[PDB]
Amino acid sequence: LFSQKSFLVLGFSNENESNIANIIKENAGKIMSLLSRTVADYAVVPLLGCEVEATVGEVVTNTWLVTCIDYQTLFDPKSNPLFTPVPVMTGMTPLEDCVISFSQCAGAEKESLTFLANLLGASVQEYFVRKSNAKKGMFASTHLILKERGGSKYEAAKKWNLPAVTIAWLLETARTGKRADESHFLIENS
Amino acid sequence: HSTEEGLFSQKSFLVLGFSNENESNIANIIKENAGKIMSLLSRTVADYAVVPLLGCEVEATVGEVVTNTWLVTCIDYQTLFDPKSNPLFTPVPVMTGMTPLEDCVISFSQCAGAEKESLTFLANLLGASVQEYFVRKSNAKKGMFASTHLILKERGGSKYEAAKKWNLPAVTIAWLLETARTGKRADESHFLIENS
Amino acid sequence: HSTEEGLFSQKSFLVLGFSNENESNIANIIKENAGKIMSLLSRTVADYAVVPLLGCEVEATVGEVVTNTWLVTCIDYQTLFDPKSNPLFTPVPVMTGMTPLEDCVISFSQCAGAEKESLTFLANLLGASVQEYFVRKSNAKKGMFASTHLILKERGGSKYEAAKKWNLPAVTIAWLLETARTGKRADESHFLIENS
Amino acid sequence: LFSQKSFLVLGFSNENESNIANIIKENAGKIMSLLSRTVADYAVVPLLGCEVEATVGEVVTNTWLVTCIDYQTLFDPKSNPLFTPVPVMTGMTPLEDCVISFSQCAGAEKESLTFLANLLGASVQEYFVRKSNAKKGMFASTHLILKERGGSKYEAAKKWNLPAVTIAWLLETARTGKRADESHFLIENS
Amino acid sequence: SDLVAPSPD
Amino acid sequence: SDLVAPSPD
C-alpha cells in the first residue's frame, strides 16, 4: 500500500517508535535514520505534535497512519484535522464539568477524539444518558459530539434538549483553552 | 466564542497611568470579565499591567505590559488576542512634540471600535484631522472635508475602491505608526495597500 | 449604509453637562462625522443638545435633547436612529438615591457597545453587580459569580437558552428601566422574555 | 546573627539563589561551593524540598531562613513543620472546592501556607466571609485555618458554623493528596 | 428508556 | 456585617 513512500518517526518512547515503524514496513513503506538520509515523504508524529527538526514532506499523526491502513486508502492529510498536529493550549481544562458521548465516530478517529476530550477535562462515556444512575454507574451527559443530522443519539439529544455539536466544537475548544459557544457549532446549522 | 466562560478568569491586573475616572472604568470592565485587581502594596506579581496607549511608568514587576486598547479589544470580541499581534496592544513609541501630519486629512477603513479610536487619537496627536467619510471634494454647504489619505488593513471594500478610483494614497497602519515613532512624515510609497 | 456620506452633515449640536475630557471627546466625535458645534452665546437654536444618560439642565432652546448614548450609537452604526426608538437615547428617569438591585447579579445578552455600557452604568447605579458571562454556580477558584438575572432583547442565543435550561429569570430592558424610574425592584414576571 | 554558620543553597533559579546567599551573608553566615568544600552546617532548599546530593547539617527551607531573620532568633528547624521540606503528593488538588482564610499567621509562615493552599487547589482570601457578594468581589469561605482558640475569625466560624481547623489539617491534606477529615483536627479539641 | 445505547462496531 | 476583615500586617 505504502510502496515507494518513506517515513521518519518522531517524539515517541522507544517501544512505540518501533511499533509504528513495523506497521509502516508491512504496508511496503521504508524507515529512515537520524542526522537522516534524504528528506522523507512523511514524518509521523504524536497527535499533539512535537519538534520537527528536519525539512520533511508532510507532518502527519499516527492517527493518520492507522486510518489509512484501516480503510486501505491513502487519505490526504488535509482532509481531516486529526491527520496533522492538533493545536492544544497546554495546561487548559475548559471542559472540566462536561460529559461527552460520541456518535458516528469509529476506530482511530474515536480514540483520538476521546484523548482530546479527557485532556481538556471532560469525562467520556460510551453511552449517552439523560439522568444519572448510581446503580448502573452512568452520569447524565452534557454534550453529544457527532458528524451528521441523524441516528439514535441525535434524536435523543433533541428529545432531552441537549446540545448536539460538530467535531469542530472540540478542536476549537482545545485550540483556545476556553469552552467554545456550542450555539455557533450546532449540528442543526451544518 | 466563549458562551458563559469567563474571559479573564484566574488572571490578575495592575492598572497604572490613568485618571480616576478611567481607572474605575477599566477596573470595572476587568471585573465584569472575571479578572482580579491587585493592590500597589500587594504581595505578588500581577499577570498584566494595563497602561495608556503611549505607555507610562511600570516600576513593579508584571507579566506583560498591555494597553487599554488591548484590554477593550479582547473584551469586545470575547477572544484572547496575543498582545504582540497588533502594535497598538502594547505601548506605542511616539516622538513627543512632532506634528508631521499637520496638513493631512485621514479616513480609516476596516478599523472599528477600540482600534479605530486609538488610531484616531494618534493621527490627532501628530496634527492631522480625522474624517469618518471618504470624499474627494470639500463641500462647504454639507460641512465635509476631502480626505488626503486612506489607512486600512487589506485590499477591498467601498473606501479601498474609492481610493483607487480617485487616485488617493491607500496605506497600511504601519505608515501612521512609523511616522509617530520617528517624528517625520513617512514615505507613502512603502506602504501601499496594493503591495501586500 | 452611507459610503462616504457624512452622517451629521448640516446638523448642529450643543454639548452640555459633561467633564472637560468628555466634552472634547464628544465634540471631536461629532466633528469627525460632519456635525457643527455651537457656542453658549450663539445666535441660533442648535438641532441637538447632547447630554448625560441621566440628563442635566438644558436652558437654551434646542431641537431635541439626546444622550451621548444616542450619539455614539448613531455614529457606530452609520445609521440615524430615531431618538424615541430606544429609551436610553434621551434622558433616563432615575429615582436618585435608591439601590433596589443591591443583591442582584446581572448579565446582558444581545446588547453591545454603547447601549450595553449605559445599561451597565444603570445597573451599577441601582446597586447591582454586572458580570460579562452567564453562569449558574459561583466558582471561587476561577473568580466567577453566578448571575441572578439575564436582561435581553429577544428570545434566542446562547445566554437565552442557558437561562431557560437553568431556570433563571430572563427579562426585557424595560424591567431595569422601570426599576430605576420608580426606585423599587420591579416584578420580573411582567417582563419575561417569553411573553413578547 | 548567623556568625560561624555555613550554608549550601540548592534547587532555585539563578536569581533566587543569589538573593538568598546575600541575606545569609548579612547575618554573618558563609556560602559554599559545588563539588563542595566541607559539609555545610545548613542546606537551604525550596519549601517542597529538592534533591540533596551532599551530606549536610540540616536540610532547611527558605521559610526557616526568613523567619529566623524576622524574629532575630535561631529557631530549631524541628519546631515548625514549614522549616523543613513539606511532603506533597504531586499533582493532587484535594481542596479544589475550598475557600480558605488564615488567622494568627504572619510573614513567611502565612506566605508558605498560602502557597500550599493554592497548590492543592483551594482559593485563599484575605477576608473571612459567610455570604458571597458579587459587588465587593468576595466568595463565601469554607474553612478557617488557625493556631489558637480565639480572635475575630474564630468567633465568626462558630457563629456561621464553619470548621475552624489547625495547620496540621492542611499539611496532612498535602501529604496524602486527599482532603483530611476536618472533624479530627478541630481547633476546639486542641 | 432514559439511556441510549452504543455505536456497536 | 457578614464578613470579617484581614490580619493587617
Residue numbers in the entry:
A (entry chain C), D (entry chain D): 552 to 741
B (entry chain A), C (entry chain B): 546 to 741
E (entry chain R), F (entry chain P): 360 to 368
Task: Show the paper's wording.
53BP1 and TOPBP1 are multi-domain scaffold proteins that individually contribute to the genome stability functions of mammalian cells. Amongst other roles, TOPBP1 is involved in replication initiation through its interaction with TICCR/Treslin; the DNA damage checkpoint through interactions with 9-1-1, RHNO1/RHINO and ATR; and sister chromatid de-catenation and suppression of sister chromatid exchange via interactions with TOP2A and BLM. 53BP1 is recruited to sites of DNA damage through interaction with post-translationally modified histones and is strongly implicated in the process of choice between the non-homologous end joining and homologous recombination pathways of double-strand break (DSB) repair, as well as the localisation of activated ATM that is required for DSB repair in heterochromatin. Using a structurally-derived consensus pattern for phospho-ligand binding to the N-terminal regions of TOPBP1 and Rad4, we have now identified conserved phosphorylation sites in human 53BP1, and have biochemically and structurally characterised their interaction with BRCT domains of TOPBP1.
However, the 53BP1-pSer366 peptide did show a clear interaction with TOPBP1-BRCT4,5, albeit with a more modest affinity (Kd = 20.6 ± 1.9 μM). Treatment of the phosphopeptide with λ-phosphatase or mutation of Lys704, which is implicated in phosphate recognition in TOPBP1-BRCT4,5 eliminated binding, confirming the phospho-specificity of the interaction. We were also able to obtain co-crystals of the 53BP1-pSer366 peptide bound to TOPBP1-BRCT4,5. The 53BP1-pSer366 peptide binds to BRCT5 in a similar position and orientation as previously observed for phospho-peptide binding to TOPBP1-BRCT1 and BRCT2 (see above) and Rad4-BRCT1 and BRCT2. The phosphoserine side chain engages with the topologically conserved TOPBP1-Ser654 and with the side chain of TOPBP1-Lys704. The −3 residue in the bound peptide, 53BP1-Val363, binds into a hydrophobic pocket lined by the side chains of TOPBP1 residues Phe673, Ser703, Lys704, Ala707 and Trp711. Additional specificity is provided by the hydrophobic packing of the side chains of 53BP1 residues Ala364 and Pro365 around the protruding side chain of TOPBP1-Tyr678, and the packing of 53BP1-Leu362 into a hydrophobic pocket formed by the side chains of TOPBP1-Tyr678, Val680 and Met689. The identified binding site in BLM - 300-FVPPpSPE-306 shows strong similarity to the 53BP1-motif we have identified - 362-LVAPpSPD-368, and binds to BRCT5 in a very similar manner, but quite differently from the proposed binding mode of the MDC1 SDT motif, which we have recently shown plays no role in mediating MDC1 interaction with TOPBP1.
